Every structure is written in C-alpha cells, then in structure tokens.
Design a binder for this molecule. Structure first.
Ligand code: MG
Ligand code: ZN
Ligand code: ZN
Lengths: 57, 1484, 107
C-alpha cells in the first residue's frame, strides 16, 4: 500500500460572523481570513425551487 | 437580521429616472473643484475627493452629519462641468432625435399627422389596449391643413373615448395596464417611429433640407454640408419664411437644437418616453441626455484599497481627478475668451480652442462612466459601467449570489450509525456556529447552562444580547462572570422603551437544529436539503449517511460539502418541513426515488432474508434492539413487540425474513393495518434452486412471507418495499424504515461479514472446457467475415492473393472499412455472447449465494454480469470510436501481426480474461479502448450549466397560483393547469397502481381521512359532468380529432379539482374505469372509485410551487448524463441547444417524417424515395474524356460516358430525356461561365508577389441537326452536340476557343461543374430515405423541409400526419399550437434516446413559455426582451443596456419577479411568500 | 374571401382594409391544397363569443393581454378569420391528462 501525499481537509472552514468588504458589506473571500461560503446563482435557484422563501431571505 | 428589530416601512416599487442638474446642486454636501485628494501633513484638501463633507475619513468626523467612519453613511457631492457633456448611456438616443429633426421649423422632418398617429397609438398603449391602437389606423378621411387638422381631431376623439370607455370598466386603471404583449406592441411602435423619423430627408412640414449628422465611436457629432441641389432648395423656400414673421458641432449647439425640438414635439415624446401614463405631469426635457454636473459618490464607496502595508489609490478618484483638471483648464480658457475683442477675422482658432476644450472634458466624462467609449491611453482604468459588469457583473456576483455568515465547509465522510435525515457535525463547527435564542420562562434553564458553559464547552454560548440592543461577549470571561450573567438573564426590563423585548443568547448549535447541506454543483433542489444536526465527539469531518449519496451526487472520494446554519424560526421551519431530506424521497424529474441504501446493506439483505438464514431468541432480539431503540423514538408502541418463532420444536428459531417483519411492526403506526405488496427481485428463482418462489417479494399485513430484498426493494428504486411504505404510511415512516434497515444491515455485516476473493473468480474444470471450445470457433470467424464483405465464394484461404488485393481496397476507404468492422464485430460478439451464456453461471466453480462476485452483480450492490464476464470469460472485441482497432497504412494493426491479417485477435478481439491474464497484443488493444473513454471526457465542450441558467432566469417567477393555473411573476398566465391535470409529480406514482391501492384500501382510506373533508367538498356536480363528457367521447371514438364534438369540454375545465370529487383528468378517468371493467373482485367497485378519486384530489400540486425552476432543473440535471458523443441527426445537448437556447430556424439536420399509406407497397415507396431524392449529374456519369487538340483554335472534345440507361433509371428514377434537358440548358451555360471566369483569373494575377509577406498558416439525324443548330444559337463557344438518343449511354460536344486562350485544365473544370449541376431537385430537400417502420408505423424520413411539395404527393403520403423536427418551419405552415407540440415531442426524443424519463408536465411548461407570444422564443437575451422586470433583465446580461432602456421608458419596477425582489431585499413571492400571515386579536 | 392564383399587386393589397366594417381575407389556392386544421398536431381551435371571453377573463381574473397569445397572421388564426381581441379555445390531447382546454388571445 501507498500513502498519497494530499491532506484533503485543507479547505476545512467555519464562519459565524467574520470581516466584510466595504462596498458590498458582504462576507469577504478567504478561508484563513474567516471568510464566507458563497451561495451562488444555482443555490439561489435551488432555494427558489423548494419554494423556501425564508431560506433564500 | 434581528427579530427584536422589526421594520414598519417597505419598498413597494422602484422608479427609473434621470437626475437633473438643479436636483444634484441642492442635495450636494460639497462642490468638488480640486484635483488633489490630500493636503500636506495628511489632511484631506478642501474641495477635493476626500473632503470631510463627503463623509468621515482619516479618523476625522464627517462635516455634514458629524458621525465617525462606522455610523456615517457617507454623503454625495458634485462636480460643476464648465460646459455640458453628452451622457454616454443616452448618446445613441439623443443622436436619433438629432438626425430626425428639422433645423429650421424645429419639428421632426416626419409629417405632423403621421407623428400624431404614433402619439395616439402610444397613448392608447399606456393603457392595455392594443386592439384600439390598430383600429386607429382605420380612421381615415399634398393634403390641406384644414382637412389634416380634422383627421388629428377625429383621431384624438377616438383616443379620448377608447381610454374613458375602458377606464369606466375594469379594463385599465388610472395608472394604466402593462403586460409583456403590451410591452411588445410598445417596443414595436417606438422602433417603427424612430425608423420612419430617420428615413425622411426633406422636412414634410417646411420643405427645406437639413444638413446630415455623422458620428464616431466616441461621443462626438459632425455636420455634413448640403449638396447644391439642396442648397438651391433652401433659397426658393426662403421667401415663405418672411411672411410668417463636414464640420464638428459643439455639445451646446446639439442641446440647443434638441431644446426647441423637445418643446415643439412635446406631445409625442410624452408617450415615447413614458411606458405607463405620466401622472407626475413632468416635462420631457432635452437636458436629461446632457450632463451639466457630475455626482461625486460618498468617500465610503471611494475608499483607498489597503493590501497589507501598501495603501493603493482608488481608481474612481483617479478618473474623477482627471475631470477636475480639465474643468479648471476650460474655466481659464473661458476667462481668457472673456478678456479678448475688436481684432477678430481669423475666428478659425477660437473655434479650434473651443473644439479641443469640449472634446477633452467629454473624454474625461466618458472615461468615468464607460471606459470602452474613451480614447486609448499609452489596460485603462474601469468606468462605472465596467464596475457593474467586471466579470459576471455586480448583479450576478453580489446580488443573485452572495458570500454568507453562519456557514461551514468540510470534506464528507460516510456514517451508517447516524439517521438518514441527520448530519454529523464536528465539535469544531459546533463551538463556532451559534443561533440567536431569545431567553424565556420555558427555556431559562437550558440557556443558563449554555451561558455557564461558555464559548468553548458544548452545548454553550458565545454571546448574550441584552434588551437595550447591546452585546456582551462571553469569550474572555471566566466561569465566575458567566454564572453572574446567567442569574441576570430573566430580569425584568426597567426601561419602558424596551419592556417588549427580552434578552437573547447566541447559543452553540445543538442536536435539535436544522442545517442546509449543499454539494456543488447544485443541478437540482435535492442537492440542497435540510439535515438534523448530530454533534459527534472527536470528529474533524462532516459525517453523512449513505441514503443521501444519490440526491447530492456525492461520492466519498474526498468531496466537499457546504453547511448553512439558518438564524431564524421561519427559516428553521422551512429547512425542517419543505427542503428537509425526508420530503425529497422522490425527485420531481420522473417522480422516482433518489433515496435508498447503496452497497454493504444490499449484499447484507440478500444474505439476511435468505431461507438458509436462521436465528436464536438471543440473536433475534439483539438484531431488533440493534437497529430499533425506543429511547431514540424509533418505536410506535413504547415496548418492542416480537413475533413468535417460525420453528418451535426441537429448538426455537426465527427466520431472517421475520426480522424484516418485526422492524416494520415496530416502526409503522399501530392504528393502521400492515402493508400488502406483491413485488419482484433482481435475482431469478433459478439461482435459489428447484421450485423456489424467492423472486416474488410478498408482503401480507406487514409480513415478509416470500422473496429476498435487493437494490430493487430498499434501494432508490420505484415500487419497492420502501417506496410502497412511503405511499401508504408517508415520508417520515419511510425515512425511519431506511435508517432502521441501514442500522440492521450494518450490525448484521458486523456479526456476519461479507467478503470477495479468488474462489469467486474461478470457473470449474467443466465450465473452463466449454470456454476453450466456443473460443476455438472464433479463429475461423476472422477470415469468414473478411470473405463475406469482400464477396468471395467457397470461402477463399487467408493468404489468397485476390483476397489480399480486395482487403487493400477496404483499407483505403473509411466507409468500406466500416462495413468490414461492423460485420466482423457482430460475428465475434455473437461468439462472446455464447461463451458468457454457457459459462455464467452454469460453469462457475463457486456459485450464488456463496459466489460474492456473482452475488454483488445480481443484487445490484455493485457491478454487472458484463464486468463478471470480462473477469471469468473474456474481454471481447475492443471497440474504438464505434469501429474495431486502428490499422496502419501497411495493413498491419500491430508490428506483431501480418499485413491484412484475417484474424479476430488482429482486429482487437480479446479471448483472454482478467483472471487468467491478457496477452501483450490484447493488452495494447485494451489500452487503446480504455484510454478512448478518458479522451472523450477531455474533449467534451458540451455543458449543461448555461442551458439550465437560461431556463431558470426566465422561469424563476413561474409558479402554481391559488386558482390552480400556472402564472408568471407578473401575473401573466402561462398554463391554465399544470400538465392539464394539476398533479404533483412527487405524488403521481401509485395513482395508476390500482391493484396496490385495492390491497391497501383500508390503509389508504385511513391515510386520506375523508371524515374531515366531506363537509368541505362536492360529491356529485363533477361526477355527473364526467359521465356527460364520457358519453360524447364514446359517440365520436372512430371520428377524427377535427370532427370531434366540442359541446362539453373536460370536467377539469369546469370544476376545481380540490373542491369537486370527480374532476379528474380524462386520462385517469379512462384508466380507472378500464381497471374496474377488466378486474371483477369487502371493497365494492363503487367505494374503490371514490378512494381513487380522493387519491387524485390529495395528489394535486400545491399553490405556490415553483414549477418554473423545477422544470428547468428537471431538464438541466439529466442533460448532464448526455455529455458523451455518438456511438446522422443532431442529438444530446447540441440538439437541446437548437431548441431551448437558440430556437433556430436553420437547424443542422432538418427532417420530415412522411407517413406512407397501406395501398403503397415497399417497392413503390422506394421508387417514390428516388423520385424526391436530389439527383446530381456527377451521380449518373462514369467517365469524362477530354481530347484537347490545338489546330488552325483550342478544340475541346468532351465525351460524357454515363452508366447504362437501365442502371441509373433503376437507381435514381432519371430518364435519358431528363439528362438531355439538363446538359442542353444548365450544364453548357454553367461550363461556359466557368471557362470565361478561368480566362479572366489567368490574365488578372500573373503570379504571387515576391518579397511581400503573406498571412501565416496557424452521320447525324435531321431532328438531331435542328436541336444542335438551336443550341449553337444559345451558346457562344460550342460547335458540335451529339447525344445518345436510342441507347442513352453517352453525350459528346465540341468546344472551340480562341488562339489567345492557350493552356487550360478542362477535366478539373468539367469535374467541378458536374457535381454542381442538379438533374432533379425538389426545393429545400436533399435525400428521401426508407427506414425500418418506427413502432409499427410505415414512414419515410426526408433530409429537408418543404410541406407544400409533399402536399402534392397525397397518393403516397397521409398529409394530416406529416411530422417534422424543424419547429420554425412547422410554425410557419401549421401554426403556434403545432410548433408547441413539435417542441414537446423533439425535447422528448433527446431524452428518450438516452433512456432518461422526464415528466411531460415540465416539457409542456417549457413549450408554453416559448410560445407565450404566439411565436417561437428561445431562452436567451432575444426572447427575454418581452419581459416586465428590468431588474431580472439586468441580472441576466448587458446590465447598463437594460438599465438605459428602463430609464428611457421611465419604467416602474413592480418588484414582482424573484430577481427584482432579491435586488431590493423583499421576500420572494414563491411558496411561503405566496401569501400573508395575520394575527387574530381578541380586544376591540 | 378572395382566393388568388399566383400573386397580388402591392397597390391592390392596400385596398383590402379600406372598407370597414366589412373585412377582406386573401388566400393562395396552392396554400389551400391541404387543410391545416385536419393535421394531427393542430388541435381544435374554437373562436369564443364576446360573452364567453368576458366569462373566462372573470374566472381567472385576467386582463386581455395577460393571456397566452396567438398571432393575427398565424395559419389557424387566418383559417378561422380571427380579429384582434378574439379569444380562441384550444382542446389539445395531452399524454399526461388527455383532453385539456387551453386558450389564446389573437393580437
Ligand atoms: Mg463512485
Ligand atoms: Zn456624514
Ligand atoms: Zn421643417
């Protein structure tokens, strides 16, 4: 057996309330910087899909 | 968001308009005049971009609101432009109005009556009355002013009456009606108006010509001088003026021209610039297109970017400073202009100084707004347009999508010990993720502990929010302070201004919380479900159960998942009742399950439920409690009930199937009866020995009495045990059964393991003998097939010289090699199938159930019989891109094999298996085929990302209304009923499973409790009507659809399905009645009918359901499975793109399906195919001999040697007479034109230019004589023309050229014209073929589209059944409803080919949306143009362009589209937002 | 109804909507060779009365334009001789519900 060099849990992160960009006032990008997880257009579409308006809000 | 902080005011609508200079000057906090930003020392300079009046900056307080950098919102300032500038966004519009106006009377050059006609039509369109706008054109009486003014009066009278009449009724409000079709009619008119405006040259009011205005890329206009004809026209029309009493043009001159024109033509422009009536009564002024000032955004949005130590200057400040430098310079130029003047004459310099001043400030203004409109600087700084469209754009990157708080990301790890509805949360996340829990009397105990525990001990609390609004962090505090604050949580508020409020505790995420689990890409809503938090100690990864693997399409190969922690109870309720896992058992794509156990559990079940599996009292009870724990609420009886043993004497023993009975007996409700189901297994009875019935899965009163349980029962498979339980007992019970079975099989695999080894891969000595004997016949097959394709009798030897020459002919042609490959492959694959059928399983040493390799393939746990056969028998023929192994120019497939080897092995046929090993030749061939697949995964440009994105943006608003109809975001009707029956796909499964429903009558009657509904519905109205429609339907059964009765329409059209029992789809009605007739079986046939009627009632789609998104997700998500290439017509994503994304009128493969009659034979149809197929001259010619002889004149003897007359007449249906006409009329005229063109090309360019660089690579009859003489008179170069009239085999003609024409390549010239000459062609059709009858229907497939031509072939084709794939062509001839039906059929063909089932309810919705305008609109920028929401449009693409169109319309965004609501932070109107919640209060 | 053979003069085509309330409809005999409403993909289109339209707009609380559209120049719309505002009832066979009644407004 061979042990592969990669430590897969390198992108392991958690954010409650971290720093925000001045213009958008939205969580700033950066795992180590206590950054936010992006909820993109597809996740927006999925939250519209369930008809779950408060989850989207 | 704080629930303690409610908001009383709300934004209901957004109005788009232009800021006036006067407006900006008043609101401005400070006038910006200085280009410098900082004074010395470091303080902001007064009158600069960093002035403190624009807000708090550099630890200084704001000089306007006085607040610091945190609380100061920032303030807008202004730059005073020394000269007006064209606003870049509205330059194109002001340009249109400048070119359209007269420079003398200062009216538009179009006649006043024509202008008034547009103003009238546009006023009527402000209100929703299109019919009236067209009826205005009917109002009709070089024409006198007294007559034309009466026409304007009569037209204005009709407009005032039509508005008032519609205003009296509910046709239009005072604010005016506005729909997409109304918008389409407005957009058409405003376009037509500007087109008519620009077309007029000479002014229709005063006959004088105006000088034409030209433009460049940048905002700058020039005036082209008039021609002498137009200058003399100005002179003769100069006297009539008296009785009434290229050069650059400055911005001021243009503004002054438009100022008067916008005053004089105010009436039409009032309706040209207002989408709805102008209730504000504002004047439409020209200065809206001009900028006399520039607003300076607050310092807050122009802060210098800090990256580590370096503080970088803001790019907007840089562009603004540039505008400030130019402004100071023009102020000096105007000051010097003011000084001096007596001395003038040479005024060409003062205008040149002015032109520079104007073009410089304009460029600086342009550079700030839109950089792609400014001059090139030696990458430029991005403008505000560029800021809104940087990449995807501000709307897409920061509004439609956002980075969020209270969220975590981690690699997922599998876990069978957690519930199927749970998520294993690491304690790392649990101590950081908090919920704002308000402290009350009922939870003071729970939160006091959390407060004491603090932020590092779970379950704790990171913070405490007091009722005054302040926050107290528990992070730095010791156990002593935390204990003190806990005893201060429920203290009454002294302040009366906050007595309403109570303290909040920001408590750690507990085991009762909801979380949103997300696995990207989120192709369908099942990839974003709600999970129950289960904090697992000593964990560093997110733990997920195997039942969730399918929906997320997540494999534990180092995958990552996003965890979202919603922060309020309304968001909690949604994640627990709507988006929760259990409510996502069935996908809306096909209504089939996406939840079930995956591998060990399937293999465990086949063993546990096997007859051989017995268990003692101790063992049996252990397996029960092992998976069912009453303390964890798994039971429904508060005491574990146990069945008696199946064996009493000698020893008490329980069967394996009894454990499955006991698990159901403790998880299903006691009040309801046991499940009754007769299903089947994946494992055939033959495997379980003689006379076994172990394939028949039998459940009688919730007891497994026969058959084992496969992937077909507790996997994500339809009509299995879990699905049957889901239908009878609900989603919560099915979830419990899945978790219970999941535990049972995990525990069973721990006590009784499952393994795979070499013994499972071996064949017996008998079985291996069979393998070698069948594979012994494969040696002959190679040469046999090679002798068949080559056409050689008695089967010639492998080393035959004629055969080897014949195989070479095949090698050089791609088509010929294809015939050889397909024949040899089919023959060797037949030998493969024989080996596999004989050896597996009757020849395997170890056999099922003990052969685990065999077991896993049969159970559906993992692998198939194909993989099993490659392991134990042979790999077979290695197929490469539909064919065999690639062959070299030498005829060798490898250097080891003989050239043109007639052997199966040489072609890639592997006789070897993976157990015994594969030979090096076979190894290399396997390497080819193995890699071939990975190469396809690398070269696959087709993506379902953009296809789904285009559908979702146009369908987001589309949902189910409370009136059961499918309505868009703006209230416009898309469908009158979902799929025409209003059924939820996630319910339409057992609705036709009548036998199932009958066997579970009392179970379902208790489920669909009618006792609490009988008083709310009608039991006869619809049922009576259903009989009346069935009566008229049976009367016209044999009659065609056009002759069918239209007296009574469907029962669903007249009676609400949720209020009238019996208002069911005629499809369901026919199916239900047919079951009661064909099956005569204490349940009556009448009481069963009522239950099924009630089941349909309870299967209705809920009002609010986002059927739009669901439809696009149901077309998008499975279109990912068709990313692979073809194994003629366009398939997969490219074909789906031709329909949905581009709505192409020019399809790649246009076809026509012609249904042939019964009276037309197979020979007659093939003759008919030839009659329509395009015939070229090339197709009938065998040889062309050109005898170039130079004598006296270049003589060219062109002899056309065709194929035999009977040969081409039987192969193309072409006569000798038909050949004569084409050569004598078309071919010679085409040949003469080609020779003349070649003579010119020879004399034009003598050769390429040397030294100059070229672009980089990367005896005759009397009748014959009259015919020849007539052709000589019609052709300038021919002398002779003789054609075979008797036999019809040749055509000879002599061509005479000049002595100066010299050398020419006639053969190549002739060749090219022959394949260009058409003998017979039916317009737009290339070839008509005869394929195999499709599902029993005799049809002909055309490679072209022309209906009118096929209409003439009524004797052969049924003109009422002529199908076509081309949607636009169908729409043009047969109408919108026919095109609509073509869209639903064609999209279905794309999915049916890849064996993917998509509910027609989705396709019908998509088609209805494409045909909403009566045309064929695609899901793209073009189709979207006719949509109400400008915000939805802005968040799709060309944000500034759609914004410009919105401002010019003076549009009101009603905030009714999902996109618009997200933009303004309003709650989405879909699902939970489709209503309002009001509280009932008792006191008056 | 005026059934022409090959083509109509552009000057003659202007005389078509010149005499209201009388309406003139032109059709090419080559285009009338086969009836389009007889085709399997063309459902039964029925023109509704001013009262039937009035009732439909009430049941669904619709505004004329808020409905699915049929072009005034659509082959079926030209066949039934539809005018702007006229609502057409479409009885279409579905492979989910069977007979289904949908509607379209001619604009
Ligand atoms: Mg996998
Ligand atoms: Zn301030
Ligand atoms: Zn004029």
């Amino acid at each position: 057996y061979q042990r592969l060099r990669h430590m897969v849990n390198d992108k392991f992160q958690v954010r409650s309330t971290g720093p925000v960009n001045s213009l958008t006032m939205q969580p700033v990008k950066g795992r180590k910087r206590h950054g936010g997880i992006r909820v993109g257009e597809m996740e927006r579409d999925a939250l519209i899909g369930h008809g779950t308006s408060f989850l989207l809000q | 968001m704080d629930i303690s902080k409610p908001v009383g005011s709300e934004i209901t609508s957004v109005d788009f308009g232009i800021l006036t200079a006067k407006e900006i000057r008043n609101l401005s906090a400070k006038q910006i005049t200085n280009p410098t930003v900082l004074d010395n020392l470091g303080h902001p300079v007064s009158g600069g971009l960093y002035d403190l009046a624009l807000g708090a900056f550099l630890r200084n307080l704001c000089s306007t609101c006085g607040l610091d950098e945190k609380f100061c919102p920032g303030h807008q300032g202004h730059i005073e432009l020394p000269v007006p500038c064209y606003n870049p966004l509205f330059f194109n519009q002001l340009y249109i109005y400048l070119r359209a106006s007269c420079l003398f009377c200062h009216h538009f050059r179009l006649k006043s009556v024509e202008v008034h006609r547009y103003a009238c039509k546009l006023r009527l369109l402000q209100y929703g009355l299109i019919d009236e706008s067209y009826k205005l054109d009917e109002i009709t009486l070089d024409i006198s002013s007294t007559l034309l003014n009466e026409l304007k009066s009569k037209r204005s009278e009709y407009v005032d009456m039509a508005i008032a009449k519609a205003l009296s009724d509910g046709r239009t409000t005072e604010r005016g009606s506005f729909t997409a079709t109304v918008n389409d009619e407005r957009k058409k008119l405003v376009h037509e108006f500007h087109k008519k405006l620009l077309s007029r040259g000479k002014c229709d009011n005063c006959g004088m010509f105006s000088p034409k205005f030209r433009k460049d890329g940048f905002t700058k206009i020039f005036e082209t001088a008039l021609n002498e004809k137009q200058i003399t026209n100005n002179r003769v029309k100069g006297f009539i003026r008296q009785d009434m009493i290229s050069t650059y043009i400055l911005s001021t001159e243009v503004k002054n021209i438009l100022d008067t024109v916008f005053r004089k033509e105010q009436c039409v422009l009032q309706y040209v610039f207002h989408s709805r009536p102008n209730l504000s009564r504002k004047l439409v002024k020209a200065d809206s297109f001009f900028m006399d000032v520039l607003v300076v955004p607050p310092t807050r949005f122009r802060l210098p970017s800090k990256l580590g130590e370096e503080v970088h200057e803001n790019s907007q400040n840089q562009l603004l400073s540039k505008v400030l430098t130019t402004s100071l310079l023009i102020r000096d130029l105007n000051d010097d202009l003011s000084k001096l003047k007596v001395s003038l004459e040479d005024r060409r310099v003062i205008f040149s100084r002015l032109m520079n001043a104007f073009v410089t400030i304009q460029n600086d203004v342009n550079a700030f707004i839109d950089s792609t409109k400014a001059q090139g600087r030696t990458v430029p700084i991005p403008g505000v347009k560029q800021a809104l469209e940087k990449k995807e754009g501000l709307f897409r990157k920061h509004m439609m999508g956002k980075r969020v708080n209270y969220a975590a990301r981690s690699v997922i790890s599998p876990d069978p010990n957690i519930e199927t509805n749970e998520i294993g949360v690491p304690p790392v996340f649990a101590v950081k993720l908090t919920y704002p829990e308000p402290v009350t009397a009922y939870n003071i105990a729970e939160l006091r502990q959390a407060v004491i525990n603090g932020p590092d001990k779970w379950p704790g609390a990171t913070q405490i929010q007091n009722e005054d609004g302040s926050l107290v962090s528990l992070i730095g505090m010791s156990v002593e302070q935390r204990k003190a604050l806990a005893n201060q949580l429920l203290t009454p508020s002294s302040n009366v201004s906050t007595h309403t409020l109570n303290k909040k505790v920001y408590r750690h995420i507990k085991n009762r919380d909801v979380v949103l689990m997300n696995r990207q890409p989120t192709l369908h809503k099942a990839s974003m479900m709600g999970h129950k938090v289960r904090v697992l100690p000593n964990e560093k990864t997110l733990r997920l159960h195997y039942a969730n693997t399918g929906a997320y399409n997540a494999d534990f190969d180092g995958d990552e998942m996003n965890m979202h922690f919603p922060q309020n109870e309304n968001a909690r309720a949604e994640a627990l009742n709507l988006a929760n896992t259990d409510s996502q058992y069935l996908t809306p794509t096909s209504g089939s399950p996406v939840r079930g156990l995956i591998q060990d559990h399937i293999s465990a079940g086949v063993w546990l439920t096997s007859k051989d599996s017995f268990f003692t009292r101790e063992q049996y009870q252990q397996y029960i409690y092992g998976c069912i724990r009453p303390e964890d609420g798994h039971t429904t009886r508060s005491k574990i009930v146990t069945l008696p043993p199946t064996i009493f004497k000698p020893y008490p023993l329980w069967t394996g199937k009894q454990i499955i009975t006991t698990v159901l007996l403790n998880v299903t409700p006691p009040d309801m009866p046991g499940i009754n189901l007769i299903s089947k297994n994946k494992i055939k009875n033959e495997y379980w020995g003689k006379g076994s019935l172990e394939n028949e899965v039998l459940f009688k009163d919730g007891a497994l009495l026969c058959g084992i349980l496969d992937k077909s029962q507790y996997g994500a498979s339809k009509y299995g045990i879990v699905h049957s339980l889901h239908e009878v007992y609900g989603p919560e019970v099915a979830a419990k059964v899945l978790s219970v079975l999941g535990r049972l099989f995990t525990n069973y695999i721990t006590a009784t393991a499952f393994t795979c080894g070499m013994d499972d891969l071996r064949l017996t000595a008998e079985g291996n003998k069979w393998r070698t004997d069948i594979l012994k016949t494969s040696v002959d097959t190679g040469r046999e097939a090679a002798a068949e394709v080559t056409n050689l009798d008695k089967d010639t030897p492998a080393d035959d010289p004629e055969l080897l020459k014949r195989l070479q002919e095949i090698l050089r042609d791609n088509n010929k090699s294809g015939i050889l490959d397909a024949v040899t492959s089919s023959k060797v694959n037949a030998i493969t199938s024989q080996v596999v059928s004989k050896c597996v399983p009757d020849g395997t040493m170890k056999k099922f159930p003990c052969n685990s390799m065999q077991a896993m393939a049969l159970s559906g746990a993992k692998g198939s019989n194909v993989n099993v056969s490659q392991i134990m028998c042979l790999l077979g023929q290695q197929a490469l891109e539909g064919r065999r192994v690639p062959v070299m120019v030498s005829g060798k497939t490898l250097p080891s094999f003989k050239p043109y080897e007639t052997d199966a092995m040489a072609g890639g046929y592997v006789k070897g298996r993976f157990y015994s090993g594969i030979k090096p030749q076979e190894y290399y061939f396997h390497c080819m085929a193995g890699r071939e697949g990975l190469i396809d995964t690398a070269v696959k440009t087709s993506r379902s990302g953009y296809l789904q994105r285009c559908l979702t943006k146009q369908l987001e608003g589309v949902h189910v209304s409370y009136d059961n109809s499918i309505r868009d975001a703006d209230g416009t009707l898309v469908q009158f009923m979902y799929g025409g029956d209003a059924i939820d796909i996630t319910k339409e499964s057992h609705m036709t499973q009548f036998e199932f429903c009958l066997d579970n009558y009392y179970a379902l009657l208790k489920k669909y409790n009618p006792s609490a509904l009988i008083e709310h519905l009608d039991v006869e109205s619809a049922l009576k009507y259903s009989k009346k429609t069935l009566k008229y339907r049976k009367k016209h059964s044999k009659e065609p659809h056009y002759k069918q009765s239209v007296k009574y329409d469907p029962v669903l059209a007249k009676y609400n399905p949720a209020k009238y029992l019996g208002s069911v789809s005629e499809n369901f009605q026919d199916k239900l009645e047919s079951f009661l007739d064909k099956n005569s079986k204490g349940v009556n046939e009448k009481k069963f009918r009522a239950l099924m009627q009630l089941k349909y009632m309870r299967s209705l789609i809920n009002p609010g359901e986002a059927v739009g998104i669901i439809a696009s997700q149901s077309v998008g998500e499975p279109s990912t499975q068709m990313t692979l290439n073809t194994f003629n017509v366009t398939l997969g994503i490219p074909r789906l793109r031709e329909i949905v994304m581009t709505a192409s009128a020019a399809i790649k493969t246009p076809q026509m399906t012609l249904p042939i009659w019964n009276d037309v034979s197979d020979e007659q149809a093939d003759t008919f195919c030839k009659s329509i197929s395009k015939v070229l001259l090339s197709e009938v010619i065998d040889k062309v001999i050109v005898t170039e002889t130079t004598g006296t004149a270049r003589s060219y003897v062109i002899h056309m040697r065709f194929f035999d007359n009977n040969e081409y007449s039987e192969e193309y249906d072409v006569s000798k007479e038909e050949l004569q006409n084409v050569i004598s009329n078309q071919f010679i005229h085409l040949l003469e034109a080609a020779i003349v063109k070649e003579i010119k090309k020879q004399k034009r360019t003598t050769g390429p230019d040397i030294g100059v660089a070229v672009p980089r690579l990367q005896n005759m009859n009397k009748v014959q004589r009259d015919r020849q003489s007539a052709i000589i008179s019609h052709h300038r170069f021919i002398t002779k023309y003789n054609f075979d009239d008797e036999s019809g085999k040749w055509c000879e003609f002599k061509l005479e050229l000049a002595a100066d024409t010299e050398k020419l390549l006639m053969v190549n010239i002739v060749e090219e014209i022959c394949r260009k000459s058409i003998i017979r062609q039916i317009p737009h059709i290339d070839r008509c073929v005869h394929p195999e009858p499709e599902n029993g229907k005799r049809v002909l497939v055309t490679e072209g589209v022309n209906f009118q031509a096929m209409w003439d072939q009524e004797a052969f084709i049924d003109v009422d059944g002529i199908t076509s794939n081309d949607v636009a062509a169908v729409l043009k001839t047969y109408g919108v409803e026919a095109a609509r039906n073509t869209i639903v059929n064609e999209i279905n063909n794309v999915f049916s080919r890849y064996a993917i089932s998509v509910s027609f309810r989705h396709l019908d919705l998509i088609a209805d949306m494409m045909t909403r305008q009566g045309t064929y609109l695609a899901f793209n920028r073009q189709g979207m143009e006719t949509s109400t929401s400008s915000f939805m449009k802005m968040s799709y693409e060309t944000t500034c362009q759609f914004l410009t169109k919105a401002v010019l319309d003076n549009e009101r965004e009603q905030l009714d589209s999902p996109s618009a609501r997200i933009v303004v932070g309003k709650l989405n109107n879909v699902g939970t937002g489709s209503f309002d919640v009001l509280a009932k209060v008792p006191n008056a | 109804i005026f059934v022409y053979q090959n083509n109509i003069t552009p000057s003659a085509m202007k005389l078509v909507p010149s005499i209201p309330p009388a309406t003139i409809e032109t059709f090419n005999e080559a285009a009338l060779v086969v009836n389009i409403t007889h085709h399997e993909l063309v459902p039964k289109h029925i023109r509704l009365s001013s009262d039937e339209k009035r009732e439909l707009l009430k049941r669904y609380r619709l505004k004329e334009s808020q409905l699915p559209r049929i072009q005034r120049a659509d082959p079926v719309a030209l066949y039934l001789g539809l005018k702007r505002g006229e609502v057409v009832k479409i009885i279409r066979k579905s492979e989910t519900s069977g007979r289904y009644a949908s509607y379209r407004i001619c604009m």
